[PDB]
Amino acid sequence: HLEVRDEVAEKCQKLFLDFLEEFQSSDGEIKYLQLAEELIRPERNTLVVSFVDLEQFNQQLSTTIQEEFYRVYPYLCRALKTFVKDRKEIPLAKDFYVAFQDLPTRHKIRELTSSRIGLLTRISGQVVRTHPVHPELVSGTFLCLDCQTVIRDVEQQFKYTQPNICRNPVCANRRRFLLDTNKSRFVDFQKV
Amino acid sequence: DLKGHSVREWVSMAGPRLEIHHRFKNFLRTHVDSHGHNVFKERISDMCKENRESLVVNYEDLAAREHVLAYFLPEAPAELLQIFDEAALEVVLAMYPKYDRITNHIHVRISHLPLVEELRSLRQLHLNQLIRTSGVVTSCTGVLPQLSMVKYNCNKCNFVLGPFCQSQNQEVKPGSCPECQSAGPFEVNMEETIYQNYQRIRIQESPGKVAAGRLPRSKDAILLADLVDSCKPGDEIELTGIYHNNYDGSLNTANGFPVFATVILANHVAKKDNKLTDEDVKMITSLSKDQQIGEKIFASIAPSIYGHEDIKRGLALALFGGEPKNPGGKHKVRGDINVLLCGDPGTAKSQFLKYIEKVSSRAIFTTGQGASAVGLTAYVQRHPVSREWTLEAGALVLADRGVCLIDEFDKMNDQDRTSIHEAMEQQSISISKAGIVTSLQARCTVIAAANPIGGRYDPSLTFSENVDLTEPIISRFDILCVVRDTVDPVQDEMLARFVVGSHVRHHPSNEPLPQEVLKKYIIYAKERVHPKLNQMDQDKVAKMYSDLRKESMATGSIPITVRHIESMIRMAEAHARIHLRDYVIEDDVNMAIRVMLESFIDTQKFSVMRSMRKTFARYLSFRRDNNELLLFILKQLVAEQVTYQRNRFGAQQDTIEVPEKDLVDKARQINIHNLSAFYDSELFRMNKFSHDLKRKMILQQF
Ligand SMILES: Nc1ncnc2c1ncn2[C@@H]1O[C@H](COP(=O)(O)OP(=O)(O)OP(=O)(O)O)[C@@H](O)[C@H]1O
Numbered sequence A: 001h002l003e004v005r006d007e008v009a010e011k012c013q014k015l016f017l018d019f020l021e022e023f024q025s026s027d028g029e030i031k032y033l034q035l036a037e038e039l040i041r042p043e044r045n046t047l048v049v050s051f052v053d054l055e056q057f058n059q060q061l062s063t064t065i066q067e068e069f070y071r072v073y074p075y076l077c078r079a080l081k082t083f084v085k086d087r088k089e090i091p092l093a094k095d096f097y098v099a100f101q102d103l104p105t106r107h108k109i110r111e112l113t114s115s116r117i118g119l120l121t122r123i124s125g126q127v128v129r130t131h132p133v134h135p136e137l138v139s140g141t142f143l144c145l146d147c148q149t150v151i152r153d154v155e156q157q158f159k160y161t162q163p164n165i166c167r168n169p170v171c172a173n174r175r176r177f178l179l180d181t182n183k184s185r186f187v188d189f190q191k192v
Numbered sequence B: 001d002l003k004g005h006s007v008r009e010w011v012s013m014a015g016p017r018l019e020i021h022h023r024f025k026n027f028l029r030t031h032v033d034s035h036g037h038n039v040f041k042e043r044i045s046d047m048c049k050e051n052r053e054s055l056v057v058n059y060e061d062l063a064a065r066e067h068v069l070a071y072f073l074p075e076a077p078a079e080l081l082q083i084f085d086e087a088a089l090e091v092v093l094a095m096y097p098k099y100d101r102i103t104n105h106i107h108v109r110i111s112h113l114p115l116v117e118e119l120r121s122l123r124q125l126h127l128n129q130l131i132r133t134s135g136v137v138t139s140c141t142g143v144l145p146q147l148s149m150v151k152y153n154c155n156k157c158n159f160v161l162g163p164f165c166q167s168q169n170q171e172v173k174p175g176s177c178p179e180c181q182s183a184g185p186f187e188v189n190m191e192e193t194i195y196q197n198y199q200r201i202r203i204q205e206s207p208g209k210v211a212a213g214r215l216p217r218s219k220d221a222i223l224l225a226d227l228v229d230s231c232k233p234g235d236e237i238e239l240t241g242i243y244h245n246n247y248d249g250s251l252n253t254a255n256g257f258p259v260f261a262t263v264i265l266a267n268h269v270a271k272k273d274n275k276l277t278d279e280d281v282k283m284i285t286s287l288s289k290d291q292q293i294g295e296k297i298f299a300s301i302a303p304s305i306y307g308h309e310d311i312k313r314g315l316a317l318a319l320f321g322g323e324p325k326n327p328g329g330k331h332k333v334r335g336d337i338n339v340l341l342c343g344d345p346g347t348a349k350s351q352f353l354k355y356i357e358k359v360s361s362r363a364i365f366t367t368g369q370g371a372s373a374v375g376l377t378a379y380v381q382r383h384p385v386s387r388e389w390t391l392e393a394g395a396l397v398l399a400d401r402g403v404c405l406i407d408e409f410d411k412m413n414d415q416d417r418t419s420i421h422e423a424m425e426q427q428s429i430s431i432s433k434a435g436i437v438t439s440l441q442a443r444c445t446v447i448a449a450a451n452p453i454g455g456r457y458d459p460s461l462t463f464s465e466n467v468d469l470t471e472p473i474i475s476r477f478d479i480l481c482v483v484r485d486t487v488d489p490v491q492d493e494m495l496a497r498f499v500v501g502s503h504v505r506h507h508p509s510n511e512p513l514p515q516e517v518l519k520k521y522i523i524y525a526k527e528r529v530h531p532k533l534n535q536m537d538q539d540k541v542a543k544m545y546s547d548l549r550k551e552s553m554a555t556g557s558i559p560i561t562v563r564h565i566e567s568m569i570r571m572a573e574a575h576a577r578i579h580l581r582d583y584v585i586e587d588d589v590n591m592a593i594r595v596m597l598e599s600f601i602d603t604q605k606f607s608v609m610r611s612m613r614k615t616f617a618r619y620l621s622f623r624r625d626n627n628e629l630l631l632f633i634l635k636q637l638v639a640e641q642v643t644y645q646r647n648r649f650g651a652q653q654d655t656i657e658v659p660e661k662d663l664v665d666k667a668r669q670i671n672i673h674n675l676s677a678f679y680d681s682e683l684f685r686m687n688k689f690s691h692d693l694k695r696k697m698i699l700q701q702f
């Protein structure tokens, strides 16, 4: 009914925004403000934030980010989006991404077990081959071919995902959908 | 708020919709009745008390408090009434938390809408708008169940497709099955579906309103879920509803022009009449002890008919009725007092029957002609308006526990005659028509009016050879009222004053007791739930009937029979019931004997009638104040004198007079000897009478 709130992710997002607008470098100025300055530029959409700083500022926040990275990552990106919207004049629809660096611990590729699924890890390997850069659908807006209702912002989970059901309840359509490419959003995607 | 574009979509929009919702809650919570009486708290309270799921909101009050909602209400009433229903549900659930398991939907009925349009004036301008109209319900379907929240079965995998709202506009048709994704056939799951009550009525303009010479117009209306069975064919109602265009009727079948059928979605129905169970027996009983309740009751029937007091006694007796009884289960005797008024024309017989139809509960009216809605005989056929195969049980069984009023009794069919004979002898009607072999009960009291043969009652003949009814039909009546019309200047003048007065006081630019008012009269007659009983005076009755037999054989008369004493028992029980006695007192028996004897004597031809009047004056004069007896005598004397004058002189001398000797002789004949009370009586003067003592003459100035 009231859009059940992921309270862990919401708290993580608020604390991340606080770290963003409050953490300061050695000289004493808010470093990620100076770094989000570069992020106004087109072709610029990732803010690289060091995990050492995140540990220094808020230990519980960094632990939550490390332990539940996959569920809270969109909220970290939303916090970055609000962090930059007020400062500057970005396009409304631009998407911003957060990159973490300097994890103190490194895992072996043998150690990438099913207990590490969905949590922040750093690995080292040797690049064998890189594929081309493609656009990847991250959320498509679909049209029901039965009742012409637009189901919007259905999230792809690394697979082409159609809406489970048509939003129109007297239409139980689960097969016949049309993607609206111009109404959908993509990300740059490379498989290596 | 206000509008920046069309009202329907403006109040559909989320912002203004929510504002309207909050404002209507504010209204329902904060409306006082000009005397601090918080109307809606108590209204919700009593509605929940009796589980009514419908809240009536006065449009005057809504407009006075908040005029923007009132101005938006008739422009887009579908949306506004939806909002109002949601807000009413919220306010009720806030006031009563436990009422969600009673109805889960509150209907708001808008009252006293000022937009009163007559049916002939609805146009395409009015479409989708809340209108108020008035008219007469002409037809009404039964309450039908209509799908409300319909669950469907996928009859390919049996999944139950979730509840879909059923709008009034179109059939809800599911798309795919959520599980198996079949478009294929579905069916209503009638166990998981919830239904709502549905009823179509046709309402036409009241015939009084349609005036110039033109035909009345009718509209269909749809009553839903609380409004059903609030009307009835014949009711005059006020209808508030949405003038509706868009469901499935548009004449696309090239059957003609692309015209649209319209309906009114009724939102509020208000009948135009009074609203039959008694709570104060106390007043009835207080009147019962009045010791003169009988004469008040008799004077209280047919108040708009002048005179005819004997007919009024008979009709009151019949209206109260006697005691049915059936020893063992094999000797049925009715308690119904059937009354037959036979009288020459223009003597208020039909007015008497219409009065009885007005006062009696379960009275139905029928005629010997073909000019009636109900007919005496039962038949089975397809109903003209319903199209529905119906056992059209006759007017004799439609009045099974009440009274059947048959006007123009002598002008019946042979079929009608055998029907009335069966109902009035067996108190049942036997069908053998289609495949229907049934017997169905007609325990009515029959009150009939007939005309004499030749249009004038001839007292030279007996009642039987005056009326054009067979003996078996006449014998099944307790009271035969011969309504004999004569020229009497005083009675003519009183009647003329009466009727001209009725014409004066009903212009469009506008005897010893007081008649008991007709509403408490109806209530008093509802105290026929006290069955009663007698243990009084068999000896006098038996000798009365033996002497009646000997006189009735000693002349060539219609003989008294057992039937007459049983009718006397019925009448005595009826008279005792008038007094709520619970027992039959000797004056009840004496009054019953008087009524039975008067009916029996007047039935006789003139000679036997007069001889019997002489030889039974003792019985016939009970409860007569000896002023009426003298008045009858004096009137007969002066009438004989005027019929002498009109013949010897052709014309009559005004200020007719008769000598006191004749009156005193007749008074000694009836053993009065006291005429001073008569002379001083008001009855004397009211009949335009006077006498001169020194003249020794009594006179009538006209
Ligand atoms: N005694 C009376 N008091 C008041 N009105 C009377 C009386 N007698 C006759 N009328 C009036 O006379 C009119 C004729 O009455 P009504 O139609 O009842 O007579 P009727 O006996 O039915 O005649 P018919 O035998 O021709 O049917 C009525 O409008 C009635 O109001």
Ligand SMILES: [Mg+2]
Residues within 6 Å of the ligand: B349, B350, B407, B408
């Ligand atoms: Mg008549």
Ligand SMILES: [Zn+2]
Residues within 6 Å of the ligand: A144, A145, A146, A147, A148, A149, A166, A167, A168, A171, A172, A173
């Ligand atoms: Zn659909």
Ligand SMILES: [Zn+2]
Residues within 6 Å of the ligand: B154, B155, B156, B157, B158, B159, B177, B178, B179, B180, B181, B182
């Ligand atoms: Zn199915």
